[PDB]
Design a protein around this ligand. Structure first.
Ligand SMILES: [N]S(=O)(=O)[C][C][C][C][C]C1234B567B89%10B%11%12%13B85%14B%1158B%12%11%15B%139%12B%1061B%12%112C5%153B%14874
Ligand code: NA
Ligand SMILES: [Zn+2]
Length: 258
């Protein structure tokens, strides 16, 4: 009886195995746009993905992860609210059963169809496992998805999903360029938070872009054909793999833009 997204193992149950679920800096949150304060001290975000070497894609039973070789300083996030440099290790998405839900963060209570998370670890801690034990260990770049025009840079990901339908399936996935998943603007909100899945560690500086990307209905429909279950088990479609908004508690959300 491991954690997941169902009636009996979903987000409202997580606190029993992971009591930090009721902690002081949990994610996601609702972004109240009128309460977020413009901070003129915030720097432009620096996203340097030109040398990102994607390696593989994996169905872990919760989402699919596109993994990167993080053994050299290649794909890095810096600037913005961050001190130092953070190395890309993987990205994944959260999405809904319907276009009206799926995002983890919300904007004035609006839910987007999906949310992309590009996960980066602080190089000062040497590896990802050590970084998640630190309050400034990770920087997650969150990008909303809305349904409209196709995102051409997403299609390579969509087209490999048939080969990783079920939990524990993986495939080679080299040469994928994550720059094709970014919106035009790097305007953002930022706040201190947590992983949004168990173990829910309070190690993340969140950077949520204001501008969503558009994906087509066909693209998101292919996400929804994935399975939570393993091969040869009863089919449970991989949908609604999002944690709802958690209490803001004693936090301020800062805006990079006026
Ligand atoms: N949705 S999110 O971007 O907040 C984080 C996604 C998964 C975080 C990665 C880890 B899993 B396994 B161990 B557990 B703990 B260590 B290992 B993988 B990393 C972290 B957790
Ligand atoms: Na609100
Ligand atoms: Zn995530």
């Amino acid at each position: 009886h491991h954690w997941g997204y169902g009636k009996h193992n979903g987000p409202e149950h997580w606190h029993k195995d992971f009591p930090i679920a009721k902690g002081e800096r949990q994610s996601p949150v609702d972004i109240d746009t009128h309460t977020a304060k413009y901070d003129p001290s915030l720097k432009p975000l620096s996203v340097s993905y030109d040398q990102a070497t994607s390696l593989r894609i994996l169905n872990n039973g919760h989402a699919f992860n596109v993994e990167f070789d993080d053994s050299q300083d290649k794909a890095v996030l810096k600037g913005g609210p961050l001190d130092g440099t953070y190395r890309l290790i993987q990205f994944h998405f959260h999405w809904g059963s319907l276009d009206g839900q799926g995002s983890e963060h919300t904007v004035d209570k609006k839910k987007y169809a999906a949310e992309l998370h590009l996960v980066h670890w602080n190089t000062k801690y040497g590896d990802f496992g050590k970084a998640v034990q630190q309050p400034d260990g990770l920087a997650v770049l969150g990008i909303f998805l809305k349904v409209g025009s196709a995102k051409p840079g997403l299609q390579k990901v969509v087209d490999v999903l048939d080969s990783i339908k079920t939990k524990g399936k993986s495939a080679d996935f080299t040469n994928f360029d994550p720059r094709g998943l970014l919106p035009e603007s790097l305007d953002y909100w930022t706040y201190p938070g947590s992983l949004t899945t168990p173990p829910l560690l309070e190690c993340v500086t969140w950077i949520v872009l204001k501008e969503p990307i558009s994906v087509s209905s066909e693209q998101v429909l292919k996400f929804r054909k994935l399975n939570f279950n393993g091969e040869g088990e009863p089919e449970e479609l991989m949908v609604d793999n999002w944690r709802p908004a958690q209490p803001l508690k004693n936090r301020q959300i800062k805006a990079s833009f006026k």
